[PDB]
Write a protein that binds this ligand. Structure first.
Ligand code: HEM
Ligand code: HEM
Ligand SMILES: Cc1cc(N)nc(CCc2cc(F)cc(CC[C@@H]3CCCN3C)c2)c1
Ligand SMILES: Cc1cc(N)nc(CCc2cc(F)cc(CC[C@@H]3CCCN3C)c2)c1
Ligand SMILES: C[C@H](O)[C@H](O)[C@H]1CNc2nc(N)[nH]c(=O)c2N1
Ligand SMILES: C[C@H](O)[C@H](O)[C@H]1CNc2nc(N)[nH]c(=O)c2N1
Ligand SMILES: [Zn+2]
Lengths: 407, 411
């Protein structure tokens, strides 16, 4: 019940006690492990509020103080009365930072305490949402010197007045299926791209078209907005050795900004809470470019490299993959846009884990997501045993809005 | 109940009902997943239900469930247990058991081959010398001059846990490791403890970087004895690179036959503590793990040095570049010497086909994603995108503690 995790490359052993504070469920049982599955009233609200307020006042070393009890009392009163409650700015910031801290699938959490939190709870319209999001993007991008940030729109009330960003990321490329039969641009975004067009958007029908924002305030119909191009920092992808690489015509955007998740703090639900950091190179070079269900350029690159693509055992896919990921890192670094390679990022996470085990008693971590999609075992996280469990505050998935929206 | 797994690249969805037949635990709870943890004595009491369940499965597979042969066998095993406190498997049952232990091995990506396993019955063995002979025959059979053949040799089952047969080696063929006074290691660092034991038992070590370890064999609970595998039985492959001529001068080689010899085979409640099995290598086992783990031969530096890569910052991906070249060399060398090997793209593609087939005919396929996904180029293999369910079926292979930690020495 007091658990140990071992690193098999270093023999370092850490003792986990934090998991005992876990609340939600993992999807696993004693009979079956679901570790590789992608997606497994007034009464309930006050205990949730109490659990959060307790950990908050503990963190500021005022557990059991007058101010603690008073606040517990005040929130209790507000829930009995209004059937909900509002977070103090200090509580909102703490809650958001700890949602990141608790994100077991995130390798970048060593940065968790340096999150810029933008309070957008006074927002009432989609035009206001757009304004807040432009300011976010500009602050976060910072001329290529990226800074982590989250913008938090008003919390769910009766589930009919939800704030939602319909895009999965603030910045993403459009996808269109060709009459020919293939897919132009990003296949991942074919459905969403349709809903943009099938709602007003005029598509350039290109390969790297930055999608418009589809913003929904207070449960209303969502509205289209184009992010000012001058706020969208993109990087042309070239290679430090292969001069034909530039001719592939590839580029990617600098800002990874997830906008479709749900932030839970003290029982309150923030259905619109776009957050952003900076990329690990493999997210673009391995997944975005080389997934078969994405831009899928491996064969094209291997061809230009003149590799022997007759047999899989020549490892031509593997060679091309490395070169593509060299290009991505080289390109961002050259344009002075923040990026981290998978070696640096995983070494950072090992350091973070040790910090958390020492100062917090543990660090929930999902091995399946933490290990990079290339060169797994030559990164230290591959050899690191990890315990996965769910702490709150937390980021959670939520249904795509078009399936839920009472139109 | 139904359970569905989705492949996120193909959108293919499979339905698992087989997990309902699961008995053993996973280590996970509703509150914590232990999926990345490496490693998460038996009386007459619990034995007959274990026996019965296995025999039910056996007779079902041969389309004889409930037959007179089935009921008689149950009867016979029952009376054998209550009078002798154990029982003996028929040859047919043993073969079925061994094949299904492999079939049920959720961490094994090579299971498309499970039904083609050569089972060698060594249950009549009584001495370490007898063990050595059986093991030599296994190695010769399995190696087949490079045309590798899967096989398992099964020594007598545990009785009171005080007369165990054990192969003290983790694998039948492995290179020695030597700790030097300056803190460095000569050979395979993984095998330093075992090497020191062999030396203590009287092995005259050559003290080179690739010395094949002697077999250390325990029969019937007796102290183990040293044996040298005839070198002519140990097939090795010099490693060279198809473009880089300097690669051969690194002086690398590896053995052709992967043969695990320290696991326990459970069949119908019976425990076979010595059951060496072998197949053929996936290239990455050697090229990624054996050669490039920091705690193993660790040749990334040397290789990258000779490739003249930018080694100052990690973001040059010099480690990733060297890793691919090493794995190309391993595959090239094995194929050139006509020794059976499979690359991780072929192996994972075959596993997906296997898994889909198993869902269709068996109702499921227990699989451990953490182990099934290869240690390089993960997401460009099809298993990366494949949801998997991990659960435990029997018959099974299990870990057991190393014998030198539990053995009562006779002298
Ligand atoms: C600052 C640098 C950051 C880096 C390098 C980073 C890296 C990553 C990576 C590689 C993943 C894997 C997800 C995938 O493969 O699609 C991930 C997941 C995740 N990240 Fe981070 N991230 C960063 C910042 C942040 C921030 C600022 C937040 C929130 C405030 C965050 C929250 C999350 C969450 C909630 C997930 C998992 C989502 C899920 O469950 O699917 N990350 N991160
Ligand atoms: C014939 C070709 C085979 C291939 C390519 C293959 C491949 C693999 C690989 C790559 C692993 C991961 C282990 C590691 O990374 O160290 C593995 C695990 C395993 N294999 Fe196979 N294998 C083969 C044959 C067999 C046979 C013949 C048996 C048994 C009769 C077997 C039983 C197992 C078991 C039980 C594990 C899991 C070990 C554990 O739980 O830690 N395999 N295999
Ligand atoms: C802030 C941030 C930094 C970074 N460096 N990277 C990302 C993107 C990674 C990511 C984070 C999430 F919080 C949620 C998701 C969605 C999961 C995706 C959707 C489809 C495939 N995958 C399941 C991705 C975000
Ligand atoms: C038949 C076979 C084929 C193949 N292609 N390959 C192997 C070796 C893979 C393997 C299988 C096992 F049943 C147990 C182990 C030991 C795991 C090691 C020991 C220490 C670190 N690691 C946990 C390896 C065996
Ligand atoms: C901590 C983690 O479970 C451990 O390093 C595992 C990860 N996956 C693996 N997968 C395979 N095939 N072989 C291994 O030795 C390991 N090691
Ligand atoms: C089926 C499997 O869970 C799925 O492919 C996961 C595996 N691990 C991952 N890991 C990360 N970081 N991102 C992903 O999208 C995935 N996909
Ligand atoms: Zn689990």
């Amino acid at each position: 019940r007091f658990l140990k995790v071992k690193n098999w490359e270093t023999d370092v052993v850490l003792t986990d006690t934090l998991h005992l504070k876990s609340t939600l469920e993992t999807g696993c049982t004693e009979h079956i492990c679901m570790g590789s599955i992608m997606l497994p009233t007034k009464d309930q609200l006050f205990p949730l509020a109490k659990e959060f307020l307790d950990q908050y006042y503990s963190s500021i070393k005022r557990f059991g103080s007058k101010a603690h009890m008073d606040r517990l009392e005040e929130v209790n009163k507000e829930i009995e009365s209004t059937s909900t409650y509002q977070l103090k700015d200090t509580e909102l910031i703490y809650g958001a930072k700890h949602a990141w801290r608790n994100a077991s699938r995130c390798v970048g959490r060593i940065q968790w305490s340096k999150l810029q939190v933008f309070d957008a709870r006074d927002c009432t319209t989609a035009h206001g949402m757009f304004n807040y999001i432009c300011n976010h993007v500009k602050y976060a991008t910072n001329k290529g010197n990226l800074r982590s940030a989250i913008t938090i729109f008003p919390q769910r009330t009766d589930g009919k007045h939800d704030f939602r960003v319909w895009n999965s990321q603030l910045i993403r490329y459009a996808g269109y299926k060709q009459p020919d039969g293939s897919t132009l641009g990003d296949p991942a975004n074919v459905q969403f791209t349709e809903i943009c067009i099938q709602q007003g958007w005029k598509a350039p029908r290109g390969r790297f078209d930055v999608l418009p924002l589809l913003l929904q305030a207070n449960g209303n119909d969502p509205e289209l907005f184009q992010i000012p191009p001058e706020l969208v920092l993109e990087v042309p992808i070239r290679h430090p050795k292969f001069d034909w690489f530039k001719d592939l015509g590839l580029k990617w955007y600098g800002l990874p900004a997830v906008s479709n998740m749900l932030l839970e703090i003290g029982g309150l639900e923030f259905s619109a809470c776009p957050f952003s950091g900076w990329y690990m190179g493999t997210e673009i070079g391995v997944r975005d470019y080389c997934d078969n269900s994405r831009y899928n350029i491996l064969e094209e690159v291997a061809k230009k490299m003149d590799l022997d693509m007759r047999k899989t055992s020549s490892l031509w896919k593997d060679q091309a993959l490395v070169e593509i990921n060299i290009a991505v890192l080289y390109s961002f670094q050259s344009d002075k846009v923040t990026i981290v390679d998978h070696h640096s990022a995983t070494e950072s996470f090992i350091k973070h884990m040790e910090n958390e085990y020492r100062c917090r008693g543990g660090c929930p971590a999902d091995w399946v997501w933490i290990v990079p999609p290339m060169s797994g075992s030559i990164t230290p996280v591959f050899h690191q045993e990890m315990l996965n469990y769910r702490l709150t505050p937390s980021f959670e998935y939520q249904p795509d809005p078009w399936n839920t929206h009472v139109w």
